[PDB]
Amino acid sequence: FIVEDDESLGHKELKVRKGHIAKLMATEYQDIEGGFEDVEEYTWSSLLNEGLVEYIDAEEEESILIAMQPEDLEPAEANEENDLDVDPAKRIRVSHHATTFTHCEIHPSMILGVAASIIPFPDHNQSPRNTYQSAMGKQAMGVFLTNYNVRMDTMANILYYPQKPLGTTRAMEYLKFRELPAGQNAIVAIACYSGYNQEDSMIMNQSSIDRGLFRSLFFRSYMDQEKKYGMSITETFEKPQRTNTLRMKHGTYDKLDDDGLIAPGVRVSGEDVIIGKTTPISPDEEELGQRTAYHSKRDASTPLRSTENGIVDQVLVTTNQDGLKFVKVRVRTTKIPQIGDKFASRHGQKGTIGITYRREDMPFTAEGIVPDLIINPHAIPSRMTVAHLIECLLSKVAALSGNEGDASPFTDITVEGISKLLREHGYQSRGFEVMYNGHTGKKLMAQIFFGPTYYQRLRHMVDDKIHARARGPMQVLTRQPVEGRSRDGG
Amino acid sequence: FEDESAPITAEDSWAVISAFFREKGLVSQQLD
Amino acid sequence: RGNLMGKRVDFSARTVISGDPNLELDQVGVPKSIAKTLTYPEVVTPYNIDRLTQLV
Amino acid sequence: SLHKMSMMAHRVKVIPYSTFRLNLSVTSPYNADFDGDEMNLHVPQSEETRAELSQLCAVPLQIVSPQSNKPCMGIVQDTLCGIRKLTLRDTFIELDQVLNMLYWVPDWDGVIPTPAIIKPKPLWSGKQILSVAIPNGIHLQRFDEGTTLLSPKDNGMLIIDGQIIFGVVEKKTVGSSNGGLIHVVTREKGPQVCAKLFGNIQKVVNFWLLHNGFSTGIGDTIADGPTMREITETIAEAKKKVLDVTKEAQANLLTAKHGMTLRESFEDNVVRFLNEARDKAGRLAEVNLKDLNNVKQMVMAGSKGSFINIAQMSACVGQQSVEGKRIAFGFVDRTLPHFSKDDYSPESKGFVENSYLRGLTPQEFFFHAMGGREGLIDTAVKTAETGYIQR
Amino acid sequence: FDMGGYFIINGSEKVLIAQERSAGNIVQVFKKAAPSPISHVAEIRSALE
Amino acid sequence: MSEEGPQVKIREASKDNVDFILSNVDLAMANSLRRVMIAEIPTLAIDSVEVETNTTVLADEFIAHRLGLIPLQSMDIEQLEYSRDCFCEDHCDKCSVVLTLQAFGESESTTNVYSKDLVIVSNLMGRNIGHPIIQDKEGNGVLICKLRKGQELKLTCVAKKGIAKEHAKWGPAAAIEFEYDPWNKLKHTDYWYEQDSAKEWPQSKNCEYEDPPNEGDPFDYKAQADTFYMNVESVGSIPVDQVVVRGIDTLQKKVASILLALTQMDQDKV
Amino acid sequence: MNAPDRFELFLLGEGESKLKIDPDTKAPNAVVITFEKEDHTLGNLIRAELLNDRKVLFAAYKVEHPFFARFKLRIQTTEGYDPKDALKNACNSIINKLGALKTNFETEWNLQTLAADDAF
Amino acid sequence: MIVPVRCFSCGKVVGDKWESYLNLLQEDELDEGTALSRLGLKRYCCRRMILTHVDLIEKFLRYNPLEKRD
Amino acid sequence: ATLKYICAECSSKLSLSRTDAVRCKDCGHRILLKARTKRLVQFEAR
Amino acid sequence: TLSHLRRTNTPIGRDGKLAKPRQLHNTHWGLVCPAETPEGQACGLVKNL
RNA sequence: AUCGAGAGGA
Ligand SMILES: [Mg+2]
Ligand SMILES: [Zn+2]
Ligand SMILES: [Zn+2]
Ligand SMILES: [Zn+2]
C-alpha cells in the first residue's frame, strides 16, 4: 500500500480508501452476477495505475519505512498512550514508533508460501514444526485434479471423501484448498490409553475405517508401444502361445485378449500379464522352423508389479507419433488404512497407526461420541505445537456452532474467545470431557482433551515398504544379491 | 464520506488481495 | 567399500515398526508374510523328525 | 548403526498386520520411534550363529552398556507417567482392580498382599501393587535434597526386600540412571530377571494407566491472570533495564569490559538481561501451575518434558539468535524494513515477548523462523559430519 | 483448476525451476583473506544483457 | 446378583431414541449391555455386489462400499441363516436377500440415483427384511450416486446377516449415551480445574434426577455405581426398543453358550 | 497384506475348544480358564459376578493381546467349593438378572407405547 | 465425492440429508448451524460430516460421459 | 466376438480387428478406449 | 503442484559448502517463504516464493 | 537391462 499525507484533516493516513474497496467488491459481484454494468471496472491494474499500490523490490525496500498494519498509522496510537483495551489474552504488540511511514503492508501472512499458508495458527507453533508441515503437506492424499479420470497418470492417489477443514486460513480461498482438500476431519482424543500410541504412533477407530474414513483410491498406468524397428522386423502386440515363444513369463496369460490386452473390469493380481507383446526376431534359423514354427518369437510382455494387485480401470489404445500401436493400461485399487500407515496433522506431527480398536472398545463420552484417533499426550510438551491444540478447540467450536473457524496466522482471535464460545455451547471452556473406559465402562479419573481436528493421510504406507527375501536374484558382475524391493533385492 | 474517507481496516485488505489474485493468479510469473 | 567391507545379503527383511506394550523386552513381532519368506535350514535328527516332517 | 546396541538379537513371535513390533523400552537403544521408522531383520543360518546371537547379542545382556557404566533400556513415556501417578501417596486401589493388576504379573506367586488399609475399607496403595512386580532381595537408598525417612514430599527412594517403602517412582529410579532399579537388578539378579522386570512393570503400569487415563489439553498452558500480570511486569522491568543500558552506552559512559570492545559488552549485557527475564517469567509460570496440570506432571515424571517448554508455551518465548548473536542488521542498519535505522531495542533484534499460547507478531514470527532455519541447517550438517568422524 | 505453467514433453509434464543467480552490473567490494597478498577486491560481472 | 434385579424407567421414547434410567444393576452389566448393543446384534446388509455395467463417475469399489453402508430392514433377521451355516452355493433365499439397482440418465439434468431405487428380486418368504430404511421426509432414501444423460449403472446386491464386529456396516445402533453419578459422589473422577471445578465444569443434564451432595456429609465410601442413564439411538434398521431387547437376548445367549460349553466339558470328563 | 479376516473374532477355528480349564499350581483350589473368541464384553461381566460370591477368594481376567480375541480368567474358591461350580453359579446369576432386565424393559416400553405411537 | 453415508465415528446415516441441507441453506436462508440442527445432527461428530463435505461429483459430472450424443 | 474399442471424445463402438487402422471411422481420433469387459466383476461391499 | 510451480533453486550451494548462505536472510521478508524449505542438502538452497 | 539425473523417506 501507499501511505501519503493527503489527509490534511489529520495524521498521515493510508492512500487507499473505502470507496476503492467498495468498487472492488462491486467488480467481484459483477463478475459473479450478470447484467454487466461496472464501468469502474477496478482490477489489480486499476489500483496499480491509480497510485494506490506499489511494486517494491528488495533493493528499493531498503529506503522506505513500512507499517505492519493500517492501525499503525492512527494518531491515537502515537498519542493516546492510555486505553481500556488491556485484554491480557492478546499478543503484546509494540506501540507506534515512527511517523514517517511511506508504505503499509497489504497484510502479514502474505509472507508465507503456498504450502505454509494452509497451516492453522502458524504463529502459535515453533518454526521447525512449520517447516515440517510445509514439507509434509505435499504428501497429503487428496484430489489433485477433477479430471483425474481422464488423465492416465502413473501413481495417482485420491481420497474417497476429502473433507474441508474446520479451521481454515484466509488464504485457502486463493489456494482453493476448500475446493480440492487433502485430508479429513477426525475426532481426535489426546489421551494416554492401552499404550499402543506410546511413541508418535496412534490408535485408529476400526469402525471408522469400516465406514470410509481415510479410504483412498490408487491408480497405476502401464505403458508399452510397438518397437520402432520396422526394417524387416517389428514387435507386435498379441497373446503369446506357450508353444510359440521363448522365456514366456511365469505369470498367467489366460486373462489377456486376442489384442494382447486385458479388458477393463478384470481383476488382476500378482505378476499376471497385462500387456502381451512379442518380438518376431532372430534366431532366423530354418532349424527352428523344423522345430516350433514361430520359435523365433521372443516374449516381451509386461506383468503387474509383483507387490501390487487390483482391477483394470481403463485401457487406452492409440498410435505414437511414428504410427506404431501405442497402449496404456490403468489398474486401480483401494488402499484402506492399515496399522503401518502414516498420518499427520497440519503441525508436523507425524505418526503411524499402532493398533485399531473397534467402536465399542474405544473411550466414549456421556454423549456417546467416540474418537477416530487417540494421540499420545507426550507429543505436545517437547514439540509444543500449541497451534495443534488451538486448532482442535477452534474446530470443536466451529462444528458446534456450524461455521468456519478463522485460523489465520496474525488475526486477533484469542484462546479465551474460543473458550467462551465453547462454554456457551454447554461444554468445558478448555475442551476437556469426561470419558469412560470402554472395556470396563467406568469413568476415567482424567478428563480427556477431546474434539475434531484436520489430519492428512500421507504417502508411505507399510505395504509399499514391507520386503523380505531369501536366496533371490543375484547380480552378474559381483554375484551378490541385486538391490531394490521391486527387483527382490537384498 | 465513505468514498473519500473511512480509511481501510484490517478486514478490508483482503478485498485488495482478492483483486491481486484475480488479475495475477498463482503462476503469473512463469506465464509472463 | 561397497562389495567387500559391506554387501547385500540374503535372509533379511525390512519394514516399518510399531510398539507393543504386550511384548517381552527381548521378543519381537514378525509379520506372517515375512516369516513365510525367510527360512532356517534345520538338519533332520531323531529328536525332530516328527515336527520337521509336519512342517514339510 | 552407531554403537553395539543398534544391533541386538531378539526372539521371534509371528503376528499379523505387516509391521515389526517392539517393546517400548528397547526404542532408546536403537534411538527409534514409531513416526515412520524402519528396521532391518537378519536371520542366522546355522546353529553356531544362532548360539552366538542368543549368547552374545541377546537384548537382555545389553541392558548395562560399557559406554557409560549405566543401563541403556529404561522406562519410557506412558509407563513413566503411569508409574509416577500410580506411586503417588494419594493413589489407593480397590480389591476389584487389584485382582486384575496382580493377575497381569506373570511372576505373581498367588499371594494377595494384605492391604495397607483394612478396617473402614480394604484399600491397597499403589506402591504395594508396584512392589509385587519388584523381585525379592532388592534394596535402594537414594536420598534427595530433603529426604529424611519421614519427608512429606516423597522426594527420595527406599526399597527393602523388593518392597517400595518410600518415595515416588520416576525417571531417577526406573529410568536408565546410574544406580536405579534397572541397574541394581541387572547387577544383582542378572539380565533375565531385569528383562522380566521390564515386562512386569510395563504390564502393571499400562493396565493401571489405561483404566485411569491421562491427557493434555490447551488448558494446560494457561496461567491465571495474576501470574500473567507478574510475567508482564517482569518483562517490562527487563525492557527498562535494557533501555537504561542503551542510554548509558549511547552517552559513552559505559565502560568496555576487559577483553571486549564497547559493542560486545553492551550486547552481552542486553542478552543476559533478556535471558534472565525469560527465566524469571518461566519460573513464575511453572510455580503457578497446579499438579492437575498435565504438562507439569509429564515434567515431574521425566516423561518427555522440560521447564523451558513451559516457559516458552505459557510465557515469554525469549530472545532469538543466529550464529550465537542476536538478530543482525541484514538491511542497512535495521533488521527489517518496519524499523527505523539504527535501532537496538529488544523488539527490533529478535526478542519475542509473547508466548506460543498468546501468539507471535509478524516480526517475531520471522525472527523465530530465522532461528529455526539455523537449527535445521545445523542438524543437516551434523547428520553427515558425525558419521564421517565415526568412520 | 489447473494453473498450467508447465510444458508437456513426450507426454510427461515438465517445470522450469527458477534458477537463482547473483545480479550483474553491480559493483561488489569484499575483503580477501589476510594471508593472501591482496586486501580488498572490487568485482563486476559486467554484461551487455 | 439375584433374579428380580434390574429396574427400568423410560424417561422419553421416540423411534430413533429410547431414553431410560437403568437402576439396580452392576456397572459391569450396564457396560456389557452397551458394548453388545454396539457390537453383537445381527442385522442385514449388502455384502456382495456384481456390477453388470457402470459408466458413472464413481468407481465400482466406491459404489459397493456405499451400498454396503445402506441400512436395510432387519426386523425378522432371526429367521435368516448365516451364509457360512448354509448348504447353498454362495447364497440362496433362506440365507440372503437379493437386490438389484438399475439407473440411467433419462433426463438431460442430473439424475440422483439413491436407495429408493433398490428393488428386492429374491423371495422373502414373508419375512420382514430387505427393505432399505427410508426415513427422509421427502421419501428419498440415501444418495448413492449421480448420472449425466448417458450414464448407466446396473448392479446385483446380495444382502447377508452379520454383526458389527465383522464389519461396522452391520451395526444397528448409531450412538449410545451413558452416564452414572452426575454429581461426582462416588469420586470416580477428579475434575481438572483452574480456579473452581464446580464452576468450570458444566452441570450434567441428569443432575436433576439426583440429590445434590451435602457439603458436610462424609464421603460415603461404601456406595457403588448404580442408576445408569442410557440413550440408545438406532440407525433405523431395527426399532430402538428391539435394539435393547435383542442386546439383552445376546448377552443371555453368550452366557448360555458359556454354560453349555462347561456342560459339554463336564460330560466329556464323565 | 497381512490383515486377518474379521470373522476370526467370533468364529471358532479348527481344533479350538471354547473353554480350557488348567489347574493352577501357584495356589490351591485355583484354576485358570481360557475363553476363545471372547473379549471384555463377557469377561468383565463374569469377573464382576464371580466377585459377588462369598466363597470365591480370587477372580481376575486379562486379554493378553488385542490382536487375538482371547481371554484368560483365574478363579480361586475356598476349600471344597469347586471353581467350576463358582463359574456355573456366576453364569446362572447373570442369566437370571438379564432375563429380569428384559422383562422389566418390555413392561416399561409397553407402558410407554401410548406416547410412542404419538411420537416420531 | 458424494455425501458420506453412515457418519464415520458414530454411524448415523447422514447420507440422505445432503439435499435437505442444501435446500435449507439456499431456499430458507438458514445458517449452517441452524440447518444442521433442523436435520437432527445433534452432535458435532455428524455436524462436521455434513458441514465440511465437498461435493466434487458435481465437478466430475461436467465431462462427456462416454455418451451416445455427448 | 470382436466388439471392442469405444472411441474417445465420441461414442462410436469401433469393433476393430487385427491390422485395422487405429483411427476411429467417423471421428478421425486416435484414442479408442477398450470396451469395458463383459464378465461380471465381483465386489465385496466392505 | 502449486508449490512446485512456484519454486526456485540456488546452484551455488550445490558445491555442498557449509557457511552463512543457505540461511534465512532477512531481506527475504515478503519475497520467499520463511518456513517452506526442504531438508538435507537442499535446506535453504531451495526457496519458495 | 545399463548408466546417468532428479524427487522423497529413516
Ligand atoms: Mg522417527
Ligand atoms: Zn443359503
Ligand atoms: Zn456421527
Ligand atoms: Zn464420435
Which helix (DSSP H) or strand (DSSP E) does residue E40 occupy? strand E40-43
Pairing status of strand A13-14 against strand C30-31: unpaired
Distance (angstroms) between ligand 1 centre and the Cα of A470 equals: 28
Q: Do G6 and F244 touch (CB under 8 A)?
A: no
C-alpha cell recorded at residue A30: 459483477
**Distance in angstroms between the alpha carbons of the first and the last residue of chain C:** 40
Cβ pairs C/D, distance under 8 A: 127
Positions in chain K where some atom is under 7 Å from a protein CB: 2, 7-10
CA-based nearest residue to F69, from F132, F3, F5, F153: F132
Put simply, whether H51 touches F (Cβ < 8 Å) is no
Q: What is the DSSP letter of C24?
A: -
Q: For residues D25 and D198, is the Cβ–Cβ distance under 8 A?
A: yes
**F5 closest CB neighbour out of G84, G92, G97:** G97
How far is Cα G46 from Cα E20, in angstroms, rounded to an integer? 72
**Distance in angstroms between the alpha carbons of the first and the last residue of chain J:** 14
C-alpha cell recorded at residue D192: 533375565
Sign of CA dihedral A111, A112, A114, A118: negative
Which helix (DSSP H) or strand (DSSP E) does residue C18 occupy? strand C12-19
How far is Cα J7 from Cα J29, in angstroms, rounded to an integer? 16
- Distance from the E22 Cα atom to the nearest Cα atom in chain A, whole angstroms: 13
Domain covering H1-66 assigned CATH 1.10.10.60 in the classification? yes
Q: Please indicate, yes or no, whether residues A294 and A320 belong to a single structural domain of this protein.
A: yes
Q: Please indicate, yes or no, whether residues A59 and A121 belong to a single structural domain of this protein.
A: no
Contact flag, residue D379 CB and nucleic strand K, below 7 A: no
Contact flag, residue A136 CB and nucleic strand K, below 7 A: yes
Q: For residues A480 and C7, is the Cβ–Cβ distance under 8 A?
A: yes
K4 C1' – E11 CA distance, angstroms?
21
How far is Cα A480 from Cα F235, in angstroms, rounded to an integer? 60
CATH number at residue A464: 2.40.270.10
CA-based nearest residue to F46, from F122, F146, F130, F127: F130
Q: Each residue of D154-189: b (16+ CB within 10 Å) or e?
A: bbbbbbeebbbebbbbbbbbbbbbebbbbbbbbeeb
How far is Cα D246 from Cα D250, in angstroms, rounded to an integer? 6
Contacts of A210 in chain I (CB under 8 A): 46
Q: What is the CATH number of domain F43-168?
A: 2.170.120.12
Q: Which residues, listed in sequence order, are joined to residue A375 by a DSSP beta bridge? A: A190, A202
D33 assigned to a ligand binding site: yes
Helix and strand element counts for chain I (H, E): 0, 1
* Residue position matching grid coordinates 450396564: F30
With residues binned 3-state (H G I as helix, E B as strand, rest as coil), the percentages for chain H, rounded to 5, are 40, 0, 60
**What are residue F152's phi and psi, to 5 degrees?**
-140, 155
Helix (H, G, I), strand (E, B) or coil at D252: coil
Q: What is the DSSP letter of F164?
A: T
Helix (H, G, I), strand (E, B) or coil at H12: coil
How far is Cα I14 from Cα I20, in angstroms, rounded to an integer? 10
K5 C1' – G3 CA distance, angstroms?
38
Catalytic residues of A: 200
K9 C1' – A192 CA distance, angstroms?
28
Q: Do J24 and D373 touch (CB under 8 A)?
A: yes
Q: Each residue of G17-35: b (16+ CB within 10 Å) or e?
A: ebbebeebeeeebbbbbbb
**What are residue H33's phi and psi, to 5 degrees?**
-65, -45
Helix (H, G, I), strand (E, B) or coil at D110: coil
Q: For residues A375 and A188, is the Cβ–Cβ distance under 8 A?
A: yes
Put simply, whether J7 touches B (Cβ < 8 Å) is no
CATH number at residue I15: 2.20.28.30
CA angle (A178 as vertex; A173, A179 as ends), nearest 5: 100
D220 assigned to a ligand binding site: no
Q: Does an interface of 3+ CB pairs under 8 Å exist between B and J?
A: yes
**F60 closest CB neighbour out of I11, I43, I46:** I43
How far is Cα D59 from Cα D23, in angstroms, rounded to an integer? 11
Put simply, whether A48 touches B (Cβ < 8 Å) is no
Pairing status of strand A66-67 against strand A103-104: parallel
Of the candidate CATH numbers 3.30.1360.10, 3.30.1740.10, 3.90.870.20, 3.90.1530.10, the domain formed by F4-42+169-268 belongs to 3.30.1360.10
Give the amino acid at D22: L
How far is Cα G30 from Cα G23, in angstroms, rounded to an integer? 6
How far is Cα D43 from Cα F240, in angstroms, rounded to an integer? 56
C-alpha cell recorded at residue A120: 492453522
Q: Determine the angle formed by the axes of helices F240-269 and G83-117, rounding to 10 degrees.
A: 160
**Backbone breaks in chain H after residues (C–N over 2.5 Å):** none
**What are residue D371's phi and psi, to 5 degrees?**
-60, -45
K8 C1' – I4 CA distance, angstroms?
41
How far is Cα E28 from Cα A410, in angstroms, rounded to an integer? 38
How far is Cα J21 from Cα F244, in angstroms, rounded to an integer? 69
Closest chain E residue by Cα to residue A176: E1
Give me the DSSP letters along D173-219: TTSS-TTSHHHHHHHHT-HHHHHHHHHHHHHHHHHHHHHH-EE--GG
**A317 closest CB neighbour out of I22, I39, I42:** I22
- Distance from the F101 Cα atom to the nearest Cα atom in chain A, whole angstroms: 19
Q: Which residues, listed in sequence order, are joined to residue E9 by a DSSP beta bridge? A: E12
C-alpha cell recorded at residue F84: 457360512
- Using only C-alpha atoms, chain I has a radius of gyration, in whole angstroms, of 13
Helix (H, G, I), strand (E, B) or coil at D255: coil
Q: Where are the beta strands (DSSP E) in F122-227?
A: 129-132, 143-147, 152-162, 173-179
Q: Each residue of A174-205: b (16+ CB within 10 Å) or e?
A: bbebeebbbbbbbbbbbbbbbbbbbbbbbbbb
| A86 Cβ contact list (under 8 Å, min separation 6) | none
- Distance from the D277 Cα atom to the nearest Cα atom in chain F, whole angstroms: 25
| C-alpha pair distances (Å), F56 with each of D381, F104, H61, H67 | 53, 9, 9, 11
Contact flag, residue A89 CB and nucleic strand K, below 7 A: no
Q: Which domain holds residue I21?
A: 4-46
Half-sphere exposure of F59 (CA within 13 A, CB side): 27
Sign of CA dihedral H49, H55, H57, H60: negative
| C-alpha pair distances (Å), A134 with each of D263, D367, F158 | 38, 18, 46
Secondary structure, 3-state, chain A: CEEECCCCCCCCEECCCHHHHHHHHHHHHHHHCCCCCCCCCCCHHHHHHHCCCCCCCCCHHHCCCEECCHHHHCHHHHHCCCCCCCCCCCCCCCCCCCCCCCEECCCCCCCCCCCHHHCCCCCCCCHHHHHHHHHHCCCCCCCCCCCCCCCCCCCEEEECCCECCCEECCCHHHHCCCCCCCCEEEEEEEEECCCCCCCCCEEEEHHHHCCCCCCEEEEEEEEEECCCCCCCCCCEECCCCCCCCECCCCCCCCCCCCCCECCCCCEEECCCEEECEEEECCCCCHHHHHCCCCCCEEECCEECCCCCEEEEEEEEEEECCCCCEEEEEEEEEEECCCCCCEEEECCCCEEEEEEEECHHHCCEECCCCCCCEEECCCHHHHHCCHHHHHHHHHHHHHHHHCCCEECCCCCCCCHHHHHHHHHHCCCCCCCEEEEECCCCCCEEEEEEEEEEEEEEECCCCHHHCCEEECCCCECCCCCCECCCCCCCCC
With residues binned 3-state (H G I as helix, E B as strand, rest as coil), the percentages for chain D, rounded to 5, are 45, 10, 45
C-alpha cell recorded at residue I31: 484414442
How far is Cα F157 from Cα F63, in angstroms, rounded to an integer? 11
Contact flag, residue J15 CB and nucleic strand K, below 7 A: no
Pairing status of strand A103-104 against strand F111-114: unpaired
Q: Determine the angle formed by the axes of helices A127-136 and D362-390, rounding to 10 degrees.
A: 80
Give the amino acid at A372: D
C-alpha cell recorded at residue J34: 520463511
Distance (angstroms) between ligand 4 centre and the Cα of H66 equals: 10
K3 C1' – A477 CA distance, angstroms?
15
Q: Which of A360, A361, A433 to mutate to test the interface with F (most CBs of F within 10 A)?
A: A360
K5 C1' – D234 CA distance, angstroms?
57
Contacts of H43 in chain F (CB under 8 A): 175
Closest chain D residue by Cα to residue J19: D377
How far is Cα D157 from Cα D74, in angstroms, rounded to an integer? 17
Contacts of J49 in chain B (CB under 8 A): 29
Q: For residues A427 and F202, is the Cβ–Cβ distance under 8 A?
A: yes
* Residue position matching grid coordinates 469401433: I14
Contact flag, residue J38 CB and nucleic strand K, below 7 A: yes
Contact flag, residue D35 CB and nucleic strand K, below 7 A: yes
Sign of CA dihedral H20, H25, H28, H30: positive
**Distance in angstroms between the alpha carbons of the first and the last residue of chain E:** 37
How far is Cα A407 from Cα J47, in angstroms, rounded to an integer? 25
How far is Cα J36 from Cα A135, in angstroms, rounded to an integer? 7
Q: Do B30 and J2 touch (CB under 8 A)?
A: no
Q: Where are the domains of chain H?
A: 1-66
How far is Cα A230 from Cα F16, in angstroms, rounded to an integer? 72
CA-based nearest residue to D102, from D198, D23, D203: D203
Q: Do F221 and D292 touch (CB under 8 A)?
A: no
CA of A458: nucleotide with nearest C1': K9
| C-alpha pair distances (Å), D111 with each of D105, D200, D232, F138, G32 | 12, 16, 58, 67, 16
Cβ pairs A/E, distance under 8 A: 6
- Total domain count, chain I: 1
Q: Please indicate, yes or no, whether residues A100 and A169 belong to a single structural domain of this protein.
A: no
**A402 closest CB neighbour out of H10, H32, H45:** H32
CA-based nearest residue to A480, from C4, C1, D42: C4
Counting beta carbons within 10 angstroms of the beta carbon of residue F265, is it exposed (0 to 12), middle (13 to 18) or buried (19 or more)? middle
Closest chain G residue by Cα to residue F36: G41
| A432 Cβ contact list (under 8 Å, min separation 6) | A447, A448, A449, A450, D215, D217, D219, F192
**Which residue segments constitute the domains of chain G, with CATH numbers given?**
1-115 (3.30.1360.10)
Q: For residues B2 and A19, is the Cβ–Cβ distance under 8 A?
A: yes
Closest chain H residue by Cα to residue A403: H32
Distance (angstroms) between ligand 3 centre and the Cα of F5 equals: 33
How far is Cα I20 from Cα I35, in angstroms, rounded to an integer? 16
Q: Which residues, listed in sequence order, are joined to residue F52 by a DSSP beta bridge? A: none
Neighbours of chain F (3+ CB pairs under 8 A): A, D, G, H, I
K10 C1' – J7 CA distance, angstroms?
26
Q: Where are the beta strands (DSSP E) in chain D?
A: 14-15, 20-22, 38-42, 92-93, 124-125, 140-143, 156-159, 164-166, 214-215, 321-322, 325-326
Contact flag, residue J24 CB and nucleic strand K, below 7 A: no
Q: Do F200 and A447 touch (CB under 8 A)?
A: no
Contact flag, residue D38 CB and nucleic strand K, below 7 A: yes
Pairing status of strand D14-15 against strand C30-31: parallel
Q: Does an interface of 3+ CB pairs under 8 Å exist between A and E?
A: yes
Q: For residues F255 and F248, is the Cβ–Cβ distance under 8 A?
A: no
Neighbours of chain E (3+ CB pairs under 8 A): A, B, J
Q: For residues D82 and D207, is the Cβ–Cβ distance under 8 A?
A: no
Name the residues around ion ligand 2, CB cutoff 5 A. F 86, 88, 92, 95
Contacts of H41 in chain F (CB under 8 A): none
- Distance from the H62 Cα atom to the nearest Cα atom in chain I, whole angstroms: 13
Contact flag, residue J40 CB and nucleic strand K, below 7 A: yes
Counting beta carbons within 10 angstroms of the beta carbon of residue A243, is it exposed (0 to 12), middle (13 to 18) or buried (19 or more)? exposed
Q: Does an interface of 3+ CB pairs under 8 Å exist between D and G?
A: yes
Give the amino acid at A19: G
In Å, what resolution does this model reach?
3.1
Q: Which domain holds residue A54?
A: 1-113
Q: For residues D175 and D302, is the Cβ–Cβ distance under 8 A?
A: yes
| D274 Cβ contact list (under 8 Å, min separation 6) | D238, D242, D318, D319, D346, D351
From the CA of A349, the nearest ligand is: 1
Q: Please indicate, yes or no, whether residues A154 and A175 belong to a single structural domain of this protein.
A: no
Q: Where are the beta strands (DSSP E) in D57-111?
A: 92-93
* Residue position matching grid coordinates 532391518: D40
